[PDB]
Amino acid sequence: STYCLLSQLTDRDLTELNECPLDPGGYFIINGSEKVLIAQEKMATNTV
DNA sequence: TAACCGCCAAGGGGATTACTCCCTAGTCTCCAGGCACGTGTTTTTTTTTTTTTTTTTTTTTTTTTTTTTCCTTTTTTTTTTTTTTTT
């Protein structure tokens, strides 16, 4: 994301920190567990 | 302008007297509708059982198998020990 430490880093900088340059991210780390948030369908509010 | 009065003339019908007659007053005598008493059969009221729809409750949702993850309380009041200040 923008506010994380892996923001706009190069492949060499990600590799030196033992991170995958091909990793897209998109997940939280909660207690060492990778958690992903699923988008939920809902009705369109304020619609007749 | 004809009401009213005076004068005169004419006639029409209610009052009067008598005769008649006939319809009702009165009195028996028989009998029958008018009336006093009893009651009814429809009319209203009340129960009674059902009917019919609405509402609520309750129970249900194919089976078997294999991996992770999180949690398996928590704040809030009461108690009890400790520390500091004062005479």
UniProtKB/Swiss-Prot annotation:
The binding of ribonucleoside triphosphate to the RNA polymerase II transcribing complex probably involves a two-step mechanism. The initial binding seems to occur at the entry (E) site and involves a magnesium ion coordinated by three conserved aspartate residues of the two largest RNA Pol II subunits. DNA-dependent RNA polymerase catalyzes the transcription of DNA into RNA using the four ribonucleoside triphosphates as substrates. Second largest component of RNA polymerase II which synthesizes mRNA precursors and many functional non-coding RNAs. Proposed to contribute to the polymerase catalytic activity and forms the polymerase active center together with the largest subunit. Pol II is the central component of the basal RNA polymerase II transcription machinery. It is composed of mobile elements that move relative to each other. It is found in: Nucleus. It comes from the Eukaryota. The chain holds residues 159 to 206 of 1176 of the full protein. Component of the RNA polymerase II (Pol II) complex consisting of 12 subunits. This is DNA-directed RNA polymerase II subunit RPB2. Belongs to the RNA polymerase beta chain family.
